[PDB]
Design a protein around this ligand. Structure first.
Ligand SMILES: CC(C)(C)c1nc2c3ccc(F)cc3c3c(=O)[nH]ccc3c2[nH]1
Length: 281
């Protein structure tokens, strides 16, 4: 049931890509008549041992996650051995939240944005409870199930925290747009559930700008900046500068963003603390 046969997965189109992987829309069509169910199918773009190890980890993480706010694992297809070839997931045709917000901005009010914020927060609370650090939380990595329901996706950079250690250090600097990283990630490559909280603050920013490109984290931080861009961004953050409140943003929401962006990770609120506050608003 959770093993999909290669010959039955029929290629339709590209959905996305990033971090050495692609996600394709396929029909799982064992009858061959174009009547089968649609699925979203992730694979490496090309072979590589480091990326294969990371891919198997992604599969193992997602398979063990069971939440209305996390994209559903369906199964896998295999290459040669037990070598995983594809990760099969539910297909959410509304696509990523970034795209959805841009398209439907004139239809989604502040209550809707708060609903999405609450749902994302609940998914992240759950992730934290599984000792999972996502590391790449952004609107482009969140999917839309319906106009009243979003789900976190993109577990390709996620890591599980050992039982005796609440952070991890990466050896190389990351390769995602720098404007979602916490200061400690920028300076020391440290990631934690608390750096996910920082990124969630940027996600709240994105929600309340409807992912408008002109005031996006990149556009606005670059404009505020004026050494290497990473060192410049780090300086800016260490001085206390932050993204400005989005146009028409409710003050209470902006205040929560600022808490998420506390300089020190131990001073940021937990997702468990943020949830009830979002629900209140
Ligand atoms: C590249 C990235 C990992 C963010 C990703 N993009 C998508 C995606 C994009 C458009 C769309 F209509 C659907 C999806 C999608 C999906 O439907 N399921 C699972 C992952 C996934 C996805 N995963």
């Amino acid at each position: 049931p959770t093993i999909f046969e290669e010959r039955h997965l029929k290629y339709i189109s590209q959905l996305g890509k990033g971090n050495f992987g692609s996600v394709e829309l396929c029909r799982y069509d064992p009858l061959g008549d174009n009547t089968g169910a649609l699925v979203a199918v992730k694979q490496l773009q090309h072979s590589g041992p480091d990326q294969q190890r990371d891919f198997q980890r992604e599969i193992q993480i997602l398979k063990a996650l069971h939440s209305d706010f996390i994209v559903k694992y369906r199964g896998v297809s295999y290459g040669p051995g037990r070598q995983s070839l594809r990760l099969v997931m539910e297909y959410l045709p509304s696509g990523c939240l970034r795209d959805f917000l841009q398209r439907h901005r004139a239809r989604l009010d502040a209550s809707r944005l708060l609903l999405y914020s609450s749902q994302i927060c609940k998914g992240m609370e759950y992730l934290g409870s599984r000792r999972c650090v996502h590391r790449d939380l952004a609107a482009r990595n969140i999917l839309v199930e319906s106009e009243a329901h979003v789900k976190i996706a993109d577990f390709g950079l996620a890591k599980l925290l050992p039982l005796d250690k609440d952070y991890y250090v990466v050896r190389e600097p990351g390769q995602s747009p720098i404007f979602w990283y916490a200061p400690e990630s920028l300076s020391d490559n440290i990631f934690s559930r608390q750096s996910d909280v920082w990124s969630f603050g940027v996600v709240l920013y994105e929600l309340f700008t409807y992912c408008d490109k002109s005031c996006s984290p990149s556009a606005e931080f670059l404009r505020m900046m004026g050494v290497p861009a990473l060192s410049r961004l780090l300086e800016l953050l260490e001085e206390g500068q932050r993204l400005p409140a989005p146009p028409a943003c409710p003050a209470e929401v902006h205040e929560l963003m600022k808490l998420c962006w506390a300089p020190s990770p131990q001073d940021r609120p937990s997702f468990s603390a943020l949830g009830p506050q979002l629900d209140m608003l």
